[PDB]
């Protein structure tokens, strides 16, 4: 049932970037693993050790102001932004995929201005909070400063929250 991504749009603070954003990138949600090899067994196995540093990145190719004006902002996690993306599907009805991500803008990379090529600024928000929804349905909600890694409702850290006494 071919889905595929058709169109994409990017918000920062309500301000639509319907225009300059030729690339988005959601934070690669990865676990920490640590290949556990130990007594009684050959071949490791790997363990949930917590997630990796979620970093997201978009790249407007216009001097956009509304994006540049969050860089190094004293209040880390002030930059909010929402990465919407419509997946078409061969049978018409498009699936809205939307990923709000309150984080810290971190860095800004304007590449080689060449007087004949889309300048293309770049950005890389060090994501703090991150909720990825599909068809208006929570699939992920990863909150580090709180411990709320919750796959579609069920909170996989509800058991460690107690043992830590949070």
């Amino acid at each position: 049932i071919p889905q595929t991504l058709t169109n994409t749009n990017l918000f920062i603070d309500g301000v639509s970037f319907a225009g300059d954003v030729p690339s988005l990138t959601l934070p690669k949600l990865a676990v920490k693993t640590e290949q556990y090899r130990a007594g009684g067994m050959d071949a490791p196995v790997s363990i949930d050790m917590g997630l990796e540093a979620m970093e997201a990145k978009f790249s407007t190719n216009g001097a956009r102001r509304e994006a540049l004006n969050f860089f190094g902002l004293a209040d880390q996690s002030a930059f909010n932004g929402v990465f919407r993306g419509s997946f078409k599907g061969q049978k018409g009805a498009s699936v809205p995929v939307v990923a709000t991500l309150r984080g810290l803008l971190k860095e800004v990379d304007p590449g080689d201005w060449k007087a004949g090529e889309k300048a293309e600024f770049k950005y890389a928000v060090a994501v703090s909070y991150y909720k990825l929804e599909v068809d208006g349905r929570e699939v992920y909600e990863i909150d580090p400063v709180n411990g709320v890694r919750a796959i579609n409702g069920v909170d996989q850290l509800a058991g460690m929250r107690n043992d830590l006494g949070l």
């Binding site: 309500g14 909010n80 709000t100 309150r102 909150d143």
Partner: peptide, 22 residues
């Protein structure tokens, strides 16, 4: 009011609210 007004606010609320929980 834009299409995303409702969401901007419901998330902004979830930010301040979450911080208070923390």
């Amino acid at each position: 009011i834009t299409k995303t007004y409702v969401k901007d606010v419901t998330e902004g609320l979830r930010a301040f609210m979450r911080d208070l929980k923390n």
